[PDB]
Symmetry: C3
């Protein structure tokens, strides 16, 4: 199942629109679009802009997830993972990276920093009740 998503390139965008590595990949690589280098000191969190804004169709969301390689090699991961991009968000997509490694890490424009996976969500209608069914799991 294919979904069309509108996407706007911002002033800082470069290159191809976010790409899937292979034809069956779940996620697109997000690329740092910071106009000046950003150093993430050990233990710190930095916001990295991506230079895109998107308009997801109704009932969909985008998830900002880590690239395993950055975590393995440098202890860099997504601080709010999985980051939720809502279908009515019209701002620049931002990636929050934390440095949990042992050396300061420089984020340069063009680096692959996260992946973005699009998935369906369901909107909840609450049915308030005073008792829930019992299950084999329980409380």
């Amino acid at each position: 199942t294919i979904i069309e998503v509108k996407i706007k390139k911002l002033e800082n965008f470069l290159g191809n629109l976010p790409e899937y590595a292979t034809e069956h990949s779940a996620g697109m690589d997000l690329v740092a679009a910071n106009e000046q280098s950003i150093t993430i000191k050990v233990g710190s969190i930095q916001l990295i802009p991506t230079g895109i804004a998107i308009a997801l169709p109704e009932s969909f969301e985008a998830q900002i997830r880590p690239r395993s390689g950055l975590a393995v090699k440098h202890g860099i991961t997504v601080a709010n993972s999985p980051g939720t991009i809502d279908a009515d968000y019209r701002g620049e997509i931002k990636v929050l990276l934390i440095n949990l490694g042992n050396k300061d890490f420089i984020i340069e424009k063009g680096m692959r920093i996260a992946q973005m996976i699009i998935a369906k969500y369901e909107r909840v209608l609450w049915a308030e009740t005073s008792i829930l069914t019992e299950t084999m799991r329980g409380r």
Copy 2:
């Protein structure tokens, strides 16, 4: 088209105010609100479990995901330690949010603070097919 799924929800004794709400009509998730009666300090490097005051019964083939909110992470280094937390359709206990302070100042969690977002989605039940060669 969005689709609606009805989910049963029980208020526990420590719930205050309103059932979890979508910030906007097109939000993927509902905001989860701290329901601790007494403030909870999360010191630098600590993990703390925060109650929400609710229990839910998801319909079959659905799960709920406990995810961080952007503000707590970027402003305070607070995030969800077991993210994304998985709420199973047969869980009948209180939903709790496990926060970690990876920032550089102690942070006090007060009743009423938005501490996470909860996204409901379908999952698929796997039947394994054992094989000797993956194509």
Copy 3:
């Protein structure tokens, strides 16, 4: 509910039971450590733990590697690249990247439950490049908004 068949290969270090759902309505299966030498995760360190299985997902399905809440609560151990993303293109050994954000060193021994694996559908995006996106209510009137 909806059942999906997934092919799975036992590698040489596989010990015993294929990943199982803890209950008939659990979203995820428990993944178990299959390391043939003990692995110590020092405080603040990150270690890759093998599971001894490889899988072949059907198209449009992913497996998400997520933390078990018990390990996080009791030991500060969680999944460093969470949610780990397994898709149809990955037929190698499933590995769990753990980080120790607790207050003492933690030894991973084979047979320990280390993560849970939730299979779900994802969508493939085709981009419609545009110069004007619709306006919405989100963030409207906030400080600094243009």
